[PDB]
């Protein structure tokens, strides 16, 4: 029988025998908690066109916030961005008129809205406003529950970026570009 | 009107952890899978330092007749960096595997390979009949029995 005995000694000299080196796969375009060589941060890693110097690993901006990193395994540069962040506002006409409303998610593309809320809420109502046929991508964010119309009326409820929402028509909430008065010559 | 009611935040999907390349993986296989094994009286010593070890691949194979670690689980000891690790390799009779234990006394332990009462290392033993046995028998080993 072949026998091998492993004897470990910890002397005053620094430790040099290791082996816990967990290394997972690389994920891009997905909000994750990344740990790069002890640098821990939550964000969306994406392929970057930056050219770090051979000795440069991290990357920072004027605010001294890590905006880029270099994956040690392969000489690639990945930029970091916050996952989605944003506020949620409710565009609602006077309750005396109707109870239907619309939901505006600030500065986020409409694709991520269902996950940017987790969709695990009251089975109707909240899930109804997490998606639908009437989903409009505005410069102020994503609007769900309002029908975009090519017309232009006087601003009623200011959404932003020159876009306002109203209730006029089966009455329903619509979103449009505010008309800055009536043309005259 | 419009009222800012709440805030939303996309949570991390699962995780990601990335570390650099594997640098000179500790030569555990060089000793475990050594072509030549020294005798018990002259067990071969290999020093291990300045390397990154990986023994889970062989540990989970369940190919070892004994994988006994004293004072720590065989896998838990991995989550700790050591200053030096010595591998002592030899070949002994199966019935003699029990003799490689801390504080044990006998013809082999007291004369060939002695371990202290306080022991934290690991003892691994597996069958070697496929290499140390053949037609006509092998007589290439020696053992020390007499000493002052």
């Amino acid at each position, epitope marked *: 029988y072949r026998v091998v005995v492993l*004897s*470990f*000694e*910890l*002397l*005053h000299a*620094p*430790a040099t025998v290791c082996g816990p080196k967990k290394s997972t796969n690389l994920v891009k375009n997905k909000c994750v908690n990344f740990n790069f060589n002890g640098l821990t941060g939550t964000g969306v890693l994406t392929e970057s066109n930056k050219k770090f110097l051979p000795f440069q690993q991290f990357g920072r901006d004027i605010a001294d916030t890590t905006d880029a990193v270099r994956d040690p395994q392969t000489l690639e540069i990945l930029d970091i961005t916050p996952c989605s962040f944003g506020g949620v506002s409710v565009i609602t006409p006077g309750t005396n008129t109707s109870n239907q409303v619309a939901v505006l998610y600030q500065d986020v593309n409409c694709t991520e809205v269902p996950v940017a809320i987790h969709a695990d809420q009251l089975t109707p109502t909240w899930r109804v406003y997490s998606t639908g046929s009437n989903v409009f991508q505005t410069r102020a964010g994503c609007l769900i529950g309002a029908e975009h119309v090519n017309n232009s009326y006087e601003c009623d409820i200011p959404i932003g970026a020159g876009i306002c929402a109203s209730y006029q028509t089966s009455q329903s909430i619509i979103a449009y570009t505010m008309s800055l008065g009536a043309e005259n010559s | 009107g419009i009222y800012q009611t709440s805030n939303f935040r996309v949570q991390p999907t699962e995780s990601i952890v990335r570390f650099p390349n594997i640098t000179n993986l500790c030569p555990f296989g060089e000793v475990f899978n050594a072509t030549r094994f020294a005798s018990v009286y002259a067990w071969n010593r290999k020093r291990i330092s300045n390397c990154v070890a990986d023994y889970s691949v062989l540990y989970n194979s369940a190919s070892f007749s004994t994988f006994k670690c004293y*004072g*720590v689980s065989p896998t*838990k*000891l991995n*989550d*700790l*960096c050591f200053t030096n690790v010595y591998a002592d390799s030899f070949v002994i009779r199966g019935d003699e595997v029990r003799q490689i234990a801390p504080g044990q006394t006998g013809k082999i332990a007291d004369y060939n390979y002695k371990l*202290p009462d*306080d022991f*934290t290392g690991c003892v691994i033993a597996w069958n070697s009949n496929n290499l140390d046995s053949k037609v006509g028998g092998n007589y290439n080993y020696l053992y020390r029995l007499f000493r002052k």
Partner: nanobody
Amino acid sequence: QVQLVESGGGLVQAGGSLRLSCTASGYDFSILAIAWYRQAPGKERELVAAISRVGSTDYADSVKGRFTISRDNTKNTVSLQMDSLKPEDTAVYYCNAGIPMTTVLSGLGFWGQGTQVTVSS
């Protein structure tokens, strides 16, 4: 890496009592042995006490019967209590960490910073 921090000590009169604490970090406390050595000005370093990972204890003949050793694994702390202290005990005490291979007992283990203990006549 192995990190030890010593705390306590100070000045005490003859016949009093004192306590030294050693805090551990950067390793697994459950599989380690820890000891206290001491050194006085113009004197060689000598062992004061030692405790293995299984609660086994050992003292020096000069301090046996007066010093008590304990270790709290949950807090990863090692405590030494000195009773009936005498002026000869005045020294800097060092906390040493070693795998119980005689490594801690041989003084080849990791070292901290030390703590001063003074005993007046």
